[PDB]
Symmetry: D2
Subunit: 317 residues, 4 copies
């Protein structure tokens, strides 16, 4: 007995008495992710080096085309695209998909772990599809998750029912359910943040970090980790517990991370896992988007760690 | 045209006029690296999950076995083995290999980049091979390098004539020379260190760090990055420039990283690349080891960055 | 735009307003076939040769376990199994699957193309499942097809709607629809038969062959081809046209090929393609099985070629 | 222990005391074979089918390019090229390679086993390399063998010291020595020939064939097998014993198969394996060619079987 992503999705679609439109969608995503994974591990690079005689772009095209061919979407929002992609009426479905085809594109040259981030909305309204359909608060997410191309490829899927992790067996090109109904640690022992912006941190953030290195109660300090790729940092948080942070500073007073295809999908995954995702002031998933490429500060991870910072945030209020 | 590791290695062996003994060794190493990469990528995991019909220990076995069969080694030092392995008189060769089969094994469950580290010495004290033969300063390295199992697999090889990077094309199981004679930037813009040990840093490290976040002349501060995997962090340093640091602290008064199979190979690669690798007080490669599992502090990266920290070390003494 | 087997099956299940039970079944088969394909191409053979320190049996276990885990079957008939496999009431579905996990097992050692043959029946009755449920004439087939592990892996699926061919892209482990609604040639130019049994052929067969080598109308003779693996021979017939034959002789007066999991699936595929499948006397698909391992003579291929022999058969009646 | 082609080849080069020039050649060949196997298995075909973002010509380019870069060849003869290719003075070596990049190209669309055939001569007439250098009897072969892309990929290598079979482990892209010093059965029980040419067979062939179906002393008749792919049929002959025949006929008065890149390599492999390879009148390897694309009749296989046919040839003369 072994559970594959294809089996899992189908059984979940069956229990939910769906028309099978969303299952077609999730199966198309699974395929896109396997295609991207293969391109990322450099299969066929020899030909590029003349054996017989861009990566973010290839990833964008793969997701966009595999998604359109699902006949289950009406609007697509990509980080690589200025405007939202409205699906041809021939292949038009009822879902809105926001995604980041290849996050951590800067890390590509250094071979650091990268990934794909996606969020699925059910179109709410009854008129010609437009960018306005993507502009829904993260709380309205039908499904969300990510694919991490690290030492191994893994797809983390989060739905109303919970969070489940699927490992890619590259030998047979099938995702195996290796961890079901994942719940995050209450309190971790690692903080993640680009301390190279110390000079720009607000007093609350500055205080929290200081508390981590120099525990006032003289407990053991927190270990530091900052890969540089959100999917890698956040996935480690989900699995090992702790706190990831990318608050505002000179690098945009609105933070760097995007709301629709980065913050929301990860916040959704986090909350479903039993953790928190805040901007320091409000819950990320309750923000009403104003633009499809709207940025937003984010602090996420173990509940007890995120709450501790939230208090320090209140102190300086 | 297309250059494969196999062709490159043989070609170099010929120019060098070797008896082809080292070529056999480097060829065996290459084979061990492709076997580990495959295991790491989780190929065939569906079989563990009951489709019907460890990773560090497996990596250890692969490297040991594949090396012994090369008939080119006499002494082997693994991080996984308390004692140095002495090869059978039947399979003995003139080379001593010091390696770390799978480095960053804590990051495995989190799916973060990991790797293999190797250092090759030539047994000169023609006596019965013993542990003593591995106890040579890194200055005596014949060849050294590493394999990074990140988003893609790469093998960095360093020898007297330079450093060369080989990307693995998993389709055909061939390493392609993607970068020739690699040389690191004089000055970088990223510092790498576990700041969670701030409470235990010596005044030199403490001053340098704060100088990176708050630059005297108001210039751009350095970005921070700390994957938690030496091979990953050092490769980023090599490719993008900057400085990696794992100084001595209370928990590790002599540092955490090992001299023979971690510090030395990376120090050797750094020097051949045109960078510096120091203990803070002296060059890593000149240290004459006393224990095969001897630890050593390490600071490496761009020359200009490493020098700056070395001056601060001189200032506080 | 590209069609995958997973997409195809789902859309076909949707048009047919199924409960999704048979789709779960076809998806489980797709997975089993990819697993077998990988084992056949020898991935991981190095470990068997001690790098770090039966095939028909593995194939049987894979299909049996992957099928049971579909929760869509009640009875399974395998060539490798003396008795039919009755599914545990926990995983019991409504379908009966007859199959040959690895046909041409004798050819394995010679590396000749081999394959998998399957036929799907819908249980007809309302009582405890038993072998009796498998004993239905081939005309009652819901679906049938085969997987050919040759120069490339291909799955041919035949249903009431038609015959469609899917090519396995081993890089992403996905079956691509490369040929839809396949129809066989009216008249081919190749005959396939083990002429090493000439001494045992009945006069009709003997006459046909003679007509092929020495055309009475002085037309061009037929080329000969006999791979030795039914799936390979039959697939070539389906694609290039011609006639495949395995009539009775001293090698059992009932022929060698099995009715349920070899003759029927291939006859079904053939008829759906626009060809014929006969025992010389009757249509293969109309035979009422008496035993699950019942053998049956078979002549299949292009209509005009099969009819020509049928006449010669009548002449000698 | 585990023996890889790479290790085996180098080891043999060392014992032979070669300048490592031929080793480079055999290493390049090996690389070309893994590239062809991958293309043949249809890896990445999903990209032709619009997932968004020949085979014989491609195989030709791969072999030519990978061989030229080995800096070990001066003259190349391909079935795909009318004229012999003369390597640039810059990349020239002392070896002449005669090859058939992808044999059985008619069987491609039918997915039947196909392969690569190669013969290696040493240029002895030290003059400007020309077509003349390839015109040497197969008796002058330094090395010969083939790659079979069947159910699994295998590389058969034959040299003065014997014939060795290497199985490809596609996971790690390594050829493993699965069979050492291969030697064919004295007598087989399978005859291989296209009997569709019965109307044009000489009385010797005709008598031998009928003697196989109707044995004088009532013994068991021979089984028939004719894949239609030389490499596949010859490999079956090598592994299981028997006789392969492609005699001269009206359509091919001098046979169909080429001397330099088909007959010779297989004849060489046969002789080293302990079998016989005849034209019916003389040994294939002793023929001094006049044309690079010269055809030649061929009969090969177990010694006892080939001898029997040779006696019948003597009887009718
Ligand atoms: N694979 C599935 N897994 C879980 N829920 C699903 C699945 N498919 C559909 N649903 C649900 O049923 C609703 C409508 O599905 P659908 O008819 O396919 O568009 C969805 O939005 C979810 O509530
Ligand atoms: N592949 C090679 N590349 C560069 N130098 C080599 C190679 N093989 C051997 N050498 C060198 O020649 C010395 C002796 O080689 P060997 O005779 O193979 O043990 C080595 O220790 C290096 O100095
Ligand atoms: N994937 C499918 N493709 C074509 N027909 C299907 C599919 N699934 C179910 N059917 C059909 O609908 C009947 C009952 O399906 P089911 O409810 O899934 O057992 C089948 O036996 C076929 O007639
Ligand atoms: N890998 C090898 N295995 C067996 N014999 C070899 C090998 N390499 C070279 N030789 C032989 O030594 C001769 C000259 O080799 P080379 O100096 O490499 O051109 C060859 O033509 C063969 O006789
Ligand atoms: O994909 P991008 O545009 O290159 O950025 C990725 C994001 O960039 C963040 C790190 O940025 P800093 O270097 O400012 O810390 C990560 O958390 C995210 O992956
Ligand atoms: O393989 P190990 O024993 O788990 O250690 C890996 C090393 O551990 C260092 C980080 O350890 P800290 O958490 O102490 O910083 C990295 O630089 C190296 O990769
Ligand atoms: O799988 P098996 O039991 O080894 O047999 C395979 C079948 O065996 C037939 C050939 O048998 P002959 O050698 O008698 O021709 C093929 O047509 C079929 O693939
Ligand atoms: O590559 P080609 O030109 O298509 O020919 C392949 C050869 O053709 C022979 C069979 O041809 P016939 O159909 O004439 O028997 C086989 O033995 C060889 O593989
Ligand atoms: K991006
Ligand atoms: K991004
Ligand atoms: K971003
Ligand atoms: K380790
Ligand atoms: K380590
Ligand atoms: K260590
Ligand atoms: K079988
Ligand atoms: K069989
Ligand atoms: K059978
Ligand atoms: K050809
Ligand atoms: K040919
Ligand atoms: K030919």
């Amino acid at each position: 007995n072994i559970v594959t992503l294809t089996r899992f999705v189908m059984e979940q679609g069956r229990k939910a008495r769906g028309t099978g439109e969303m299952t077609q969608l999730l199966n198309s995503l699974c395929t896109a992710v396997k295609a991207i994974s293969t391109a990322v591990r450099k299969a066929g690079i020899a030909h590029l080096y003349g054996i017989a005689g861009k990566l973010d772009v290839l990833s964008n095209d793969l997701v966009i085309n595999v998604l359109k061919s699902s006949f289950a979407t009406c609007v697509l929002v990509t980080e690589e695209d200025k405007n939202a992609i409205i699906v041809e009426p021939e292949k038009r479905g009822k879902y809105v998909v926001c995604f980041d085809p290849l996050d951590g594109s800067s890390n590509i040259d250094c071979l650091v772990s990268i990934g794909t981030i996606f969020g699925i909305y059910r179109k709410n309204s009854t008129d010609e599809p437009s960018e306005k359909d993507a502009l829904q608060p993260g709380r309205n997410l039908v499904a969300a998750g990510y694919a991490l191309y690290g030492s191994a490829t893994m797809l983390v899927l989060a739905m109303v029912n919970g969070v489940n992790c699927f490992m890619l067996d590259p030998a047979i090109g099938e995702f195996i359910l290796v961890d079901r109904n994942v719940k995050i640690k209450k309190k971790g022992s690692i903080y993640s943040i680009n301390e190279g912006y110390a000079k720009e941190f607000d007093p609350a953030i500055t205080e929290y970090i200081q508390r981590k290195k120099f525990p006032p109660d003289n407990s053991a300090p927190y270990g530091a980790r900052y890969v540089g790729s959100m999917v890698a940092d956040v996935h480690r948080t989900l699995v090992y517990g702790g706190i990831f942070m990318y608050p505002a500073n000179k690098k945009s007073p609105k933070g760097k991370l995007r709301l629709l295809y980065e913050c929301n999908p990860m916040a959704y995954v986090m909350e479903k896992a039993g953790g928190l995702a805040t901007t320091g002031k409000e819950a990320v998933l309750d923000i009403v988007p104003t633009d499809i490429h709207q940025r937003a500060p984010i602090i996420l991870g173990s509940p007890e760690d995120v709450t501790e910072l939230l208090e320090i945030y209140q102190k300086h209020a």
